Amino acid sequence: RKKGKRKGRGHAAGQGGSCGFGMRGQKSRSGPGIMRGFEGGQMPLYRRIPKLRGIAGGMRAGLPKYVPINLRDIEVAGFKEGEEVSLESL
Amino acid sequence: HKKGAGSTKNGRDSKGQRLGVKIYGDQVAKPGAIIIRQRGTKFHPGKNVGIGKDHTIFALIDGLVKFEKYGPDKKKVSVYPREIQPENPNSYRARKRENFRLQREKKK
Amino acid sequence: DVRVKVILECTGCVRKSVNKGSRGVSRYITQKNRHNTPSRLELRKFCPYCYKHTIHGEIK
Amino acid sequence: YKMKTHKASAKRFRVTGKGKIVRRRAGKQHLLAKKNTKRKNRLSKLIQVDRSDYDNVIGALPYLKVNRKV
RNA sequence: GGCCCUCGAGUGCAAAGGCAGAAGGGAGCUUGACUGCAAGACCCACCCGUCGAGCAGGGACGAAAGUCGGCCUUAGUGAU
RNA sequence: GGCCAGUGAGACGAUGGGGGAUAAGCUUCAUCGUCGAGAGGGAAACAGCCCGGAUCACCAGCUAAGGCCCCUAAAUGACCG
RNA sequence: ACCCAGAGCUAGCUGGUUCUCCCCGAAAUGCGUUGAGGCGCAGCAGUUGACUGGACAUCUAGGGGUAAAGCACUGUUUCG
RNA sequence: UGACCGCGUGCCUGUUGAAGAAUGAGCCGGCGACUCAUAGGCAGUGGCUUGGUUAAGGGAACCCACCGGAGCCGUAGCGA
RNA sequence: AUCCCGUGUGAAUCAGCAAGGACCACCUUGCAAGGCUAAAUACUCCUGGGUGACCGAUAGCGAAGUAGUACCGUGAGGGA
RNA sequence: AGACAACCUGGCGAACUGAAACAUCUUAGUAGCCAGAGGAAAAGAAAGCAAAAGCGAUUCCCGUAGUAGCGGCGAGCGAA
């Protein structure tokens, strides 16, 4: 149990009177910050790069079928006449 | 008293393109390392050394770079591998890296 | 409309389709002056579907 | 309430098996005739997002399974 | 037509750096202004840009060795 | 490389220059000092010059920069101009 | 117009933000921006892991075209 | 208590720089500001590691023994 | 696509009609253009019973005193 | 017939705000007004789901899932 930062209660406790936000400006003010990923009016990365071939209008991503096991992974779970190694036993 | 200021017709440039000698004389190189970005052939291509579309001079082999004298007032660049490169544990660098390593090992 | 990029298809691999290894016309887009060389270009070039080095006929 | 994913960005950043963020390169949609054969091959392929911009990308979509190498 | 300095010429287009039997001027034959790539470097906040030995195929030109994936180089351009 | 900040008005001085009128406590770059965020001593007072980097106590001592007629610590010291 | 409600509207703007000791300790720059007193990334703090050897000092090797100097080139210039 | 001596440019905000003749407070006492809910990342700590964990829902109510394995996370990538 | 609507058109009747994310074919599912219907669910001017790491007269309802009073406003309304 | 705290059904229906501006979009079918009725109201007994395996009217919680999607493919919105 750490005991957190009740913030702005004397300059000895440290993070006091402005509370570790420096000096005015957008990040100082109360309320929401900005958009997250916002590059300041410069074109954001997330909107100046093309979008990943298949995911650009249709084409559902290759969601996996088959529930792959391996022969390496079976050997650890041992049974002599391994009676139907299937969806049931595993 | 408050007269008008005449505009200029200047104030254009291009930010320095960063040409010149990337790998200096008597220095390590690689197969493919760019030695010189020169705008024309200030330096000329020597042995062991490619010369590109932009008169870019790059090394083909390992070895140290050499700026030879061409004949009538020009410069060449060739590359030469080096035979044997000896290291002695006698020296100060060798002493100190082993001392450091031993301290590291001693602490942990 | 003075110097223009233009559509060099192939005369080798004219448009066919069926049998998995599908033919699929090769193509090269590149520039000529319209005023200088008024008759259409007819360069020879490589076509990776022919596997040869065919004549690349001009069109539009 | 439970974080919405930034599905504008998500569609440009995939994550690979080992856990690195990957993007496609910019440039090669049109005005292709004037570029070389050479540079279109470098613009075809995927690479990592630069270590600088990881912060914004991870911050945007928080259900990635992305390993900054630790 | 001869003589004499010899590169002060030219190099499509501004400048700088270059270029001698040449990168300048002429002729023959052609289309490498080509597909598949690429060890490796330069340049950088990111986005972008740049040089590339070599291999694979299928050609060009030459007797051959070899040289050719546009231009003597740096401008001729825009992401999503 | 992980987690998580502030900053993004700078100022003067030395030099190398540009702009200006080789005017400005002017302005703009490049290299370094100090302030900024640095008390103390020298500069009468005096951010930015000189000396020096304050953990704390002593009614001890040696010195830096700078000084030794009195205000006000130390030579109304010396020898030659 | 007023009154009540949406409504604690929003305010990259100003003011204000409360107990103690110890350790470290910046920046006022570059880049982009309907941006310039805002924001992003880099640069420079703290903190915590990993990789190694440097730091300060002296001595060699490299390519530079600046101070200087010069008039063979490019301009400019006075006298014979 | 304080003869008389030496030193000593109110505090805050906020600045390149404030004793400032920049801003704020007549004084005294109270009230008066980084919180909570839910999610995501990271660190510290603990439990399990026959992998881990249950949600709603049920409980002589609420906590709570004890059930509930539905789901979730980890166990395979590559490619549109 | 499915569901509902103004304007104009305008079917069929289980050898039928509609749906199965345009659309056609084949399968499967259902029966539109008449109605009704308890529960689990939402809330507190309010009544009874219980509880509080809730308040204690600048707090707690605005209101611990005959408070929406005194007072202000033409009035809605504000309000100790 | 009128009255009635909230909850609820139906009618009309904002803007500030967010998008760092703004008109698509968002705020939202929210606030407000209007009408109506109950202890709840509305829904509701398949012209329904789903996939060749099956389910059987509604309504509410956990979940699937911040997934499939939609979106000046921007801000955001977001199922079964």
From Swiss-Prot, chain A:
State what protein this is by name: Large ribosomal subunit protein uL15c
Q: Which gene encodes it?
A: RPL15
* Basic residues composition-biased segments: 1-10
Assembly notes: Component of the chloroplast large ribosomal subunit (LSU). Mature 70S chloroplast ribosomes of higher plants consist of a small (30S) and a large (50S) subunit. The 30S small subunit contains 1 molecule of ribosomal RNA (16S rRNA) and 24 different proteins. The 50S large subunit contains 3 rRNA molecules (23S, 5S and 4.5S rRNA) and 33 different proteins.
Instruction: Give the Gly residues compositional bias ranges.
Output: 11-23
GO CC, sorted alphabetically, is: chloroplast; cytosolic large ribosomal subunit
Q: Give the shown range, full length included.
A: 92 to 181 of 271
Main localisation = plastid
Q: Which family does it belong to?
A: Belongs to the universal ribosomal protein uL15 family.
The subcellular localization recorded is:
Plastid, Chloroplast
UniProtKB/Swiss-Prot annotation, chain B:
The answer on whether this UniProt entry bears the keyword Zinc-finger reads no
Keyword Metal-binding (UniProt): no
Q: Quick one: a GO biological-process term for this protein?
A: translation
Compartments (UniProt record): Plastid, Chloroplast
| Chain spans, region Disordered | 1-18
Q: What is its main location?
A: plastid
GO cellular component entries? chloroplast; ribonucleoprotein complex; ribosome
Q: Which domain of life is it from?
A: Eukaryota
Q: Which GO terms describe its molecular function?
A: structural constituent of ribosome
> What UniProt keywords apply to this chain's record, in alphabetical order?
Chloroplast, Plastid, Ribonucleoprotein, Ribosomal protein, Transit peptide
Share what the entry says about its subunit structure, partners included: Component of the chloroplast large ribosomal subunit (LSU). Mature 70S chloroplast ribosomes of higher plants consist of a small (30S) and a large (50S) subunit. The 30S small subunit contains 1 molecule of ribosomal RNA (16S rRNA) and 24 different proteins. The 50S large subunit contains 3 rRNA molecules (23S, 5S and 4.5S rRNA) and 33 different proteins.
Q: Please give the family membership noted in the entry.
A: Belongs to the bacterial ribosomal protein bL27 family.
Role: Component of the chloroplast ribosome (chloro-ribosome), a dedicated translation machinery responsible for the synthesis of chloroplast genome-encoded proteins, including proteins of the transcription and translation machinery and components of the photosynthetic apparatus.
Q: What is this protein called?
A: Large ribosomal subunit protein bL27c
- The species is Spinacia oleracea
Full-protein residues shown here are 59 to 166 of 194
Swiss-Prot record, chain C:
Domain of life, source organism = Eukaryota
Single GO BP term: translation
UniProt-listed InterPro entries: Ribosomal_bL33 (IPR001705), Ribosomal_bL33_CS (IPR018264), Ribosomal_bL33_sf (IPR038584), Ribosomal_zn-bd (IPR011332)
SUPFAM superfamilies (UniProt xref): Zn-binding ribosomal proteins
Which keywords label this protein? Chloroplast, Plastid, Ribonucleoprotein, Ribosomal protein
Specify whether Flavoprotein is a keyword of the entry. Answer: no
Q: What is its main location?
A: plastid
Q: Where found in the cell?
A: Plastid, Chloroplast
Among the entry's GO cellular component annotations, what is one? ribosome
Q: Single GO molecular-function term?
A: structural constituent of ribosome
Gene3D superfamilies given for it? Answer: Ribosomal protein L33 (2.20.28.120)
Q: How does it assemble?
A: Component of the chloroplast large ribosomal subunit (LSU). Mature 70S chloroplast ribosomes of higher plants consist of a small (30S) and a large (50S) subunit. The 30S small subunit contains 1 molecule of ribosomal RNA (16S rRNA) and 24 different proteins. The 50S large subunit contains 3 rRNA molecules (23S, 5S and 4.5S rRNA) and 33 different proteins.
Which family is it part of? Belongs to the bacterial ribosomal protein bL33 family.
Described function? Component of the chloroplast ribosome (chloro-ribosome), a dedicated translation machinery responsible for the synthesis of chloroplast genome-encoded proteins, including proteins of the transcription and translation machinery and components of the photosynthetic apparatus.
- Protein name, as recorded: Large ribosomal subunit protein bL33c
Question: Which species does the entry assign this protein to?
Answer: Spinacia oleracea (Spinach)
Designated gene of the protein:
rpl33
Swiss-Prot record, chain D:
Task: Show the GO cellular component annotation of the record.
Answer: chloroplast; large ribosomal subunit
- Any keyword Glycoprotein? no
Predominantly, its location class is plastid
* Keyword terms: Chloroplast, Plastid, Ribonucleoprotein, Ribosomal protein, Transit peptide
A biological-process GO annotation: translation
- Location in or out of the cell: Plastid, Chloroplast
Q: Which GO terms describe its molecular function?
A: structural constituent of ribosome
What function does the entry list? Component of the chloroplast ribosome (chloro-ribosome), a dedicated translation machinery responsible for the synthesis of chloroplast genome-encoded proteins, including proteins of the transcription and translation machinery and components of the photosynthetic apparatus.
Q: Describe, as the record does, how this protein assembles with itself and its partners.
A: Component of the chloroplast large ribosomal subunit (LSU). Mature 70S chloroplast ribosomes of higher plants consist of a small (30S) and a large (50S) subunit. The 30S small subunit contains 1 molecule of ribosomal RNA (16S rRNA) and 24 different proteins. The 50S large subunit contains 3 rRNA molecules (23S, 5S and 4.5S rRNA) and 33 different proteins.
User: What's the family?
Assistant: Belongs to the bacterial ribosomal protein bL35 family.
Protein's name according to its UniProt entry: Large ribosomal subunit protein bL35c
What organism, scientifically named, is this protein from? Spinacia oleracea
The record's gene field reads RPL35
Full-protein interval shown: 90 to 159 of 159
